[PDB]
Structure formats: C-alpha cells, structure tokens
UniProtKB/Swiss-Prot annotation:
GO molecular function: 5'-3' exonuclease activity; DNA binding; DNA-directed DNA polymerase activity; nucleoside binding
Catalysed conversion reaction: DNA(n) + a 2'-deoxyribonucleoside 5'-triphosphate = DNA(n+1) + diphosphate
Region entry Polymerase, spans: 115-515
Protein name as annotated: DNA polymerase I, thermostable
Catalytic activity, EC: 2.7.7.7
Full-protein interval shown: 296 to 831 of 832
Record-level GO BP terms: DNA-templated DNA replication; double-strand break repair
Length: 515
DNA sequence: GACCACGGCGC
DNA sequence: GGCGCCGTGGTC
C-alpha cells in the first residue's frame, strides 16, 4: 500500500451506492499499480487526481466523473478483453471467477483485481490480431464515446407525459369496467392467474397454448388473438393490456427519472451484455421505446431536443441483409442492392418480405404457413444459392472450431451444434449462423459510432441514443442539416462492403417528428 | 423494506 | 424467429 495519489498509468477501483453511475454515490475510490494499492481519503475530490479511468467498469466511473464536470476518459478495461475472448463474459464477478480472483465490495481490492485481470486477459490476446484490432479500434474507444452519451442524456417532455398518463388512465378504467361486466365480477386484470380462470374455467373458452415452465393455460396475445371475436372480453383485454403495458413501463416511470443536475433522461449503454456483440440499454431501457401502435407513437414525441436544437435520426436500411450479401458473396443478392431498386419486388422474381427478414433467424415454413396464410422458402434459396451455401458453410465451421465469427473476427461459442437432440441442435444452429449477421451489423454500427463522435464535438453536436441499427443525434438548428449530412456519410462508409450501405436520415424537434 | 421466478411484452 | 422491464406471486 502507498498513500494517495497513485502513479501514472495506475489501475482504478471504485464502489458505488448503486449500479446507475448517474445516480450513484461514490463511496470509495482506489488505485493499484505493481501490486501496490493506493486508497483515497475522500473519493470525490480524488477523482481530480486521476487522468484516465483505467480498470474494471471504467466507463461507469467516467460517467460519474462527467456528471461531476470532470474530464476523466475511460482507457483499458479487463471486461472488454474478456468480452472479446468470449461474449459470455458479461460481469466482473463471472470474469474473476473464471480467470482467477474474487470480485468484492472494496475499492482497493477491485483496483488490484483490475491490474491483474488485465495482464491475464491481455496475455491471452497475444496472437489474436483480429481480436486486438477490435479492442483498439472499436471497443476501447467506444467506451469513451458511450461515457459522454450516457452523461449527456435526452430531454424529455415531462408535462406531455403527465397529461398522457391521465388520458390513458381513463381509457384503462373504461376498459376495465367493461371487462368486469362481461366477467360478471371484478378481478385483477393484471394478474394472469386470475385471468386464466375467468376465461377458461368460468366462460369456457378454448384454451389452446400453455406456459413453458409451470404449465398453465397461456393467456398471451398470440393465444387471445385467435379468440378476439369468440367473446368481446378478449378484445377488451388486449386493448387493456396494450395501455397498461405502455403506461406502467414508459408513461409513468420515465418522468420520475429526470436527473436534478442535468434535467435530462439518462440511460446506460452496456458494452458487454449480448452474445452477438450488440449493445444493450438499461436503467431505463431506451432501446425499446414504443413506436408501433398509435399510442406508442405519442410516447415517442415526449423525447424532444433542447431549445434551439433538433434531433437527427439515422437508420440503416436492411444492414443485416446487406451484410448477408457480403458474407455469402451471392452474386444475385448483391445485384439487388447494387442497382438500388426496391429490394423486394426484385427478390420476388409480401411473400418475398417475410422470408427475406426471416432467413436471418432461421424461420421455418411452419410460421410462414401461419403468417402468410398459405398451407405448408426453397424458391428463395434457389434464387440466392450462396446464401444457403453460406449458412451450411458457417454451421460446418461452427462444429469444428466450436465458434462462429463476424466479419471483423468477433466470435461466439455455440456448444450445442453437435447435440444429439434435434430440437436443441437446430436451436443452437439458428443462434450460430445469425451471430455473424447480427454481429457484423453491430460491429459496423459500433465502428461508425467511434468515427462519428469526435466529428460531432467539433461541430457542437451530440450523440443521444443508439438503437442497434439506428442513431439519434442532437444538433443546433443551424448545424442540424450539416451534421445530418456528415453523419450519414460516416455511417454509410464506415467499412466499404460488396454492397453499398444505405442510411435514411430525418430531422425534427422530437423523436417521432425526426424519424 | 428486501429478494426472485415466471409469464407477457416493448424494441 | 438479440435484448430489458413490467406486475404478480411468493418469500424473507
């Protein structure tokens, strides 16, 4: 042990009062180097001494620093190394338990664990040049970008949501009142246990589906959809469920999450959470804001730009299919994207839509038989033979090596590619050949975020949200159209493929208007 | 108060 | 056919 401050390039360790760095109280700050732990007397002011957040969960501490007006960029993170070695490595505890060490609740030990786990996992990346490139060029600099993004937050029209809440509440009460009549008695409509008995035991409706673990008569939307005219209560329940779903998840909780220092809504972009290399948003989740239903579109208008600013929404156009074309090298599918006609009138030479989106997931003919209503695909695979050839090629290589790769080299280990149970094996297969498609699209989006962000700062623009294949920026009205033009070009040319990457742009005062 | 499994559902 | 969060129900 040595007294604060630590020397240059030391690994950091810290303890928060809660997982959300924007709401966290920094309880303890420490730093280790050469096995020598430096503990801070007072954590908050000791942040001024550090010049780079370097260690486990570095981005989180960086977000807290940005919250306190301190410029503390995140550098190395053993979590990012482990994630590239294996996407199943998602948490410091799991990483420590796998590669040695104990993840505890003391800042000094965490700083020591960070230095060690790094040297361990860094030595494992020796010779892994494609994994090292992803670290230096994508993941490590992206953490610095996501730090600024999380600390920036998005402006939210709270008053509009408070108003919308009262409006939805009355339609919910109206629907709940009618369900009670048709049932002949009141009951908890939010309780699926109670709803099952009313529909299937009391009113005697055909119970079709059944729950997985416990085996109960399912009352899901899919099951109820077939009963939506068998009785009016089924129609009223599904309407009721949509409103309660949106109100209890978005309309009510979100206005309670406005930060007192920024006055904006702050989310967390988890960098090591998915098995494909995708990002995930939590606390709250802003990657699943409603947009489908009419009421959902109303909720999205609550997400507004600052006064004197505009939102810039950039969406990739079928990036996965374009990736699939590049990975397969299918001459026919490439020609469809290359010429620039409607991608689906051309792959028809609605039936063409569903499998052109479903082939990425391994959509069987069973669901297509139900979706398009024809009785019980092969026509598609003969139009694009290399696509089928690529799937078989990926699965074959997946069984040998034990993992599948993205374009840049991001790997996911699929163990059940040789299971003796067909349902298990074919399930793992669908996970196996989807990862290179979803992972590459994730790699492209990530790399696009890395290249674009410093261009935003130099133009006085902001990066607010990422929705897998979508970006939401914030730029002053003056620079708004210039930012949209530069951002569009950074995203489309992030990494030149055998097919061009298309991006649609949109500018507005809110998320709904811009998109 | 806290915790979690489950079903159901938003993207 | 990759995610996070809701209320319910149960437990501590």
């Amino acid at each position: 042990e040595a007294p604060w401050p630590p020397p240059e390039g030391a690994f950091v360790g810290f303890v928060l009062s809660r997982k959300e760095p924007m709401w966290a109280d920094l309880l303890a700050l420490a730093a280790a180097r050469g096995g020598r732990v430096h503990r801070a007397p007072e954590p908050y002011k000791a942040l001024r001494d550090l010049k780079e957040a370097r260690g486990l969960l570095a981005k989180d501490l960086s977000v807290l620093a940005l919250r306190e007006g301190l410029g503390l960029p995140p550098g190395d993170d053993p979590m990012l190394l482990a994630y590239l070695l294996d996407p199943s490595n998602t948490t410091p505890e799991g990483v420590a338990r796998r590669y040695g060490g104990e993840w505890t609740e003391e800042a000094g030990e965490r700083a020591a664990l960070s230095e060690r786990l790094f040297a361990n996992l860094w030595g494992r990346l020796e010779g892994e040049e494609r994994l090292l490139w992803l670290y230096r060029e994508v993941e490590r600099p992206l953490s610095a970008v996501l730090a600024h993004v999380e600390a920036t937050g998005v402006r939210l029209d709270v008053a509009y949501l408070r108003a919308l809440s009262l409006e939805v509440a009355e339609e919910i009460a109206r629907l709940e009142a009618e369900v009670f009549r048709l049932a002949g008695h009141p009951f908890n409509l939010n309780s699926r246990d109670q709803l099952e008995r009313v529909l299937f035991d009391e009113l005697g409706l055909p119970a079709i589906g059944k729950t997985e673990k416990t085996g109960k008569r399912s009352t899901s939307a899919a099951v109820l959809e077939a009963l939506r005219e068998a009785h009016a209560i089924v129609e009223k329940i599904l309407q009721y469920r949509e409103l309660t779903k949106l109100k209890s998840t978005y309309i009510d909780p979100l206005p309670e999450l406005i930060h007192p220092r920024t006055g904006r809504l702050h989310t967390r972009f988890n960098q090591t959470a998915t098995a494909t290399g995708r990002l995930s948003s939590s606390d709250p989740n802003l990657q699943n804001i409603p947009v489908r239903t009419p009421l959902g579109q109303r909720i999205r208008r609550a997400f507004i730009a600052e006064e004197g600013w505009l939102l810039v929404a950039l969406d990739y156009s079928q990036i996965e299919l374009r990736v699939l074309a590049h990975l397969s090298g299918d001459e026919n599918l490439i020609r469809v994207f290359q010429e620039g006609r409607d991608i689906h009138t051309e792959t028809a030479s609605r039936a063409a839509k569903t499998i052109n989106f479903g082939v990425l997931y391994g959509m069987s003919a069973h669901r297509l038989s139900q979706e398009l209503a024809i009785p019980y695909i092969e026509r598609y695979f003969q139009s694009f033979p290399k696509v089928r050839a690529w799937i078989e090629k990926t699965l074959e290589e997946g069984r040998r090596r034990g993992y599948v790769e993205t374009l840049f080299g991001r790997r996911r280990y699929v163990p059940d590619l040789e299971a003796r149970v067909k349902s298990v094996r074919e399930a793992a297969e669908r996970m196996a050949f989807n990862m290179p498609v979803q992972g590459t699209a994730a790699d492209l989006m990530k790399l696009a975020m890395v290249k674009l962000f410093p261009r935003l700062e130099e133009m006085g623009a902001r990066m607010l949200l990422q929705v897998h294949d979508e970006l939401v920026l914030e730029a002053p009205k003056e620079r708004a159209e210039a930012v949209a033009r530069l951002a569009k070009e950074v995203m489309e040319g992030v990494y030149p493929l055998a097919v061009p990457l298309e991006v649609e742009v949109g500018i507005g005062e809110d998320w709904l208007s811009a998109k």
